[PDB]
């Protein structure tokens, strides 16, 4: 229970001063299982949206990253039909210096700046590279349908 203690610390800090763009806590009594919401940033087409994320902390946190899936549908190059996220800092840039807050914030940055060259959904990555104005338009729309 270094993991528990550290998770607990991250909760405590988060609850004292949460990032303005996200909210998260444990769902029930399993404290390795949180849920969270990302507020689509103003400086993205996902403005106004509220997106639901689930979080599973592994047993040897913080040496390995948490698992993070979107539950809410999004039109995004790096997030697929099953809410899998392609995010640098859940892969090779994980560090045990990082916290779930820091992770949640990265997901915000991802909404405002996608990486089409590391796609999880090639039609969207292609649309993004090829025809950005249409990507922008398309959620937006999906933000209204599915995140409001």
């Amino acid at each position: 229970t270094m993991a528990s203690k550290r998770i607990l610390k991250e909760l405590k800090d988060l609850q004292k001063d949460p990032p303005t763009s996200c909210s998260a806590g444990p769902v029930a009594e399993d404290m390795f299982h949180w849920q969270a919401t990302i507020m689509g940033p103003a400086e993205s087409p996902y403005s106004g949206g509220v997106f639901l994320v689930t979080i599973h902390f592994p047993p040897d946190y913080p040496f390995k990253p948490p698992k993070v899936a979107f539950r809410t549908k999004v039109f995004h190059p790096n997030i697929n039909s099953n809410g899998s996220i392609c995010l640098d800092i859940l892969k090779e840039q994980w560090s045990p210096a990082l916290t779930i807050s820091k992770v949640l914030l990265s997901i915000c940055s991802l909404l405002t700046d996608p990486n089409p060259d590391d796609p999880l959904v090639p039609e969207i990555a292609h649309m993004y590279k090829t025809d950005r104005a249409k990507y922008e338009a398309t959620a937006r729309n999906w933000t209204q349908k599915y995140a409001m």
Binding site: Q15, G25, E29, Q35, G48
Partner: protein, 93 residues
């Protein structure tokens, strides 16, 4: 032991919050939202007109109107004890 108190401050899109404010477990979310529309500070690029335009979020869950603070309690919802921060999202529909 059904009507106990907790302190809420409300985090806004801006980064600014308003509160803290004292409420009872018996207070409804619906109530909490009205309080938000009311104390809404001045000079925001956004202003919620009504109650139907504000979503409240606490510990990762979107709180639904007709529930009460007490039923929007999770085992890990306030580890420290003190003020609970809740997030306000203003959606013009």
């Amino acid at each position: 032991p059904e009507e106990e108190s907790i302190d809420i401050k409300f985090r806004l899109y801006d980064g600014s919050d308003i509160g803290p404010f004292r409420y009872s477990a018996a207070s409804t979310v619906d109530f909490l939202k009205q309080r938000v529309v009311s104390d809404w500070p001045k000079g925001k690029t956004v202003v919620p007109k009504g109650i139907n335009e504000v979503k409240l979020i606490s510990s990762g869950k979107i709180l639904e109107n007709n529930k009460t603070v007490g039923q929007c309690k999770t085992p890990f919802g306030d580890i420290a004890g003190g003020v609970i921060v809740m997030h306000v999202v203003v959606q013009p529909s």
